[PDB]
């Protein structure tokens, strides 16, 4: 027997997220001591991003830009960075380099997608924008998603430099420079990353799709929070616990 009609229902909550607070805002963090932000209870409304965006790269892992509306995401986190384009290729999973060893290790098992656009008209500075700071030596390399905010003076010999600068003794921190007429590969980039899990979990952020009424005891094409199928919907006596 074939189905006759579709039934679509989603939670009745609408407010602007907004994305502009994440993307559009100014003076975001340096590469270390980066920041994490959490987003809930809003309409997805990506179409404004599709129209407005001029971003020079999109790449997504485990998801595609078509089939992106009509998805409900259980948790959303956004991370913002100031970066030099070689690091922009480095931010991919599995790579090697200063970033992947020292700063912002990113796991190969990941479901998000990462966006970059070039900020040279704003981030660069005549005389250099020294405020962007990065770390050059560490005794071992970090596991994914944790920060360090530290200073313990690096020793490059058998003898100590006694917590002060001297022979074979370096301060671990150094400053990027970006200028007018910058090297096109060197010049600064801004990168944003989003991370989520797409299944088996109550969600709050759902796409811009209107709900309809549901009809019982008929073969229908249903969509509940992205889960589709064909079948007869009937009453049940299964007492689900609050997290299920």
């Amino acid at each position, epitope marked *: 027997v074939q189905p006759t009609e579709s039934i679509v229902r989603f939670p009745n909550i609408t407010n602007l997220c907004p994305f502009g607070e994440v993307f559009n805002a*100014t003076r975001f963090a340096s590469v270390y001591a980066w920041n994490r932000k959490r987003i809930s209870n809003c309409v997805a409304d990506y179409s404004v991003l599709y129209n407005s965006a001029s971003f020079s790269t999109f790449k997504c892992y485990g998801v595609s830009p078509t089939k992106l509306n009509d998805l409900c995401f259980t948790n959303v986190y956004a991370d913002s960075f100031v970066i030099r384009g070689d690091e922009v290729r480095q931010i991919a999973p599995g790579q090697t380099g200063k970033i992947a060893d020292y700063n912002y290790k990113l796991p190969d098992d990941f479901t998000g997608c990462v966006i970059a656009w070039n900020s040279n*008209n*704003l981030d660069s*500075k*005549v*005389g*250099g924008n*020294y405020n962007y700071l990065y770390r050059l030596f560490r005794k071992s390399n970090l596991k994914p998603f944790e920060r360090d905010i530290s200073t313990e003076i690096y020793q490059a010999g058998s003898t100590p430099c006694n917590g002060v600068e001297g022979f074979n003794c370096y301060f671990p921190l150094q400053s990027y420079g970006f*200028q*007018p007429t910058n090297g096109v590969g060197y010049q600064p980039y801004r990168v944003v990353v989003l991370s989520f899990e797409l299944l088996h979990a109550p969600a709050t952020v759902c796409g811009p799709k209107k709900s309809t009424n549901l009809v019982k005891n008929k073969c229908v094409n249903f969509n509940f929070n992205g889960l589709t199928g064909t079948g007869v919907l009937t009453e049940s006596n299964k007492k689900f616990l609050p997290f299920q």
Partner: antibody
Amino acid sequence: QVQLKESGPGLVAPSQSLSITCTVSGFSLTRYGVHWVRQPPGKGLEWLGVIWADGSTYYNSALMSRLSISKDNSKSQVFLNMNSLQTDDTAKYYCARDGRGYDDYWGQGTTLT
Amino acid sequence: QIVLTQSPAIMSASPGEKVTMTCSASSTVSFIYWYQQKPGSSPRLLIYDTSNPASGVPVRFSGSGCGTSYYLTISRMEAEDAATYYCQQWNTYPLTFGAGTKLEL
């Protein structure tokens, strides 16, 4: 002290040429950068500026004929020369240095035309 | 980028009559530096990024702006005599100097 000082300022003539030099002490021209700014009488200032370690040059100008930087890189002085500068320009000429930031120091020279 | 400036002509009856200075710019500018001048003789002294002061200037200053428009606010004492202000942008060449005229008596 860290100092900027102005030396051989231009003096009145019927001839429309004018010369001015500025001299620096307490820092080397290889260690920081110095920027050069001009004011017409009764008007805001006008700017020529360049950022370098040494030997580099940058310019933007509404006119550039006969015009490029002139420099005596023994730390002695920096020099300016134009055929018609007396009528065209330079009631006052100013000598100024910049660093990374919040270390910016200015010197003022007065040109007779 | 070209930048454009407005100023009043005004007669005071006391200090504490609040004062504003404004600049408007032809295109997006990200970084600006803040400067004050006394008439008659023209040394230069600077108030820099994040609107923090240099040495040798009164503490009562604060600056915050919005795109294509920059504002800082001053309340009391000598600035009524001493303040003439210029606005300049340092993101890309040429570094246009800007123009204007301001007075209080």
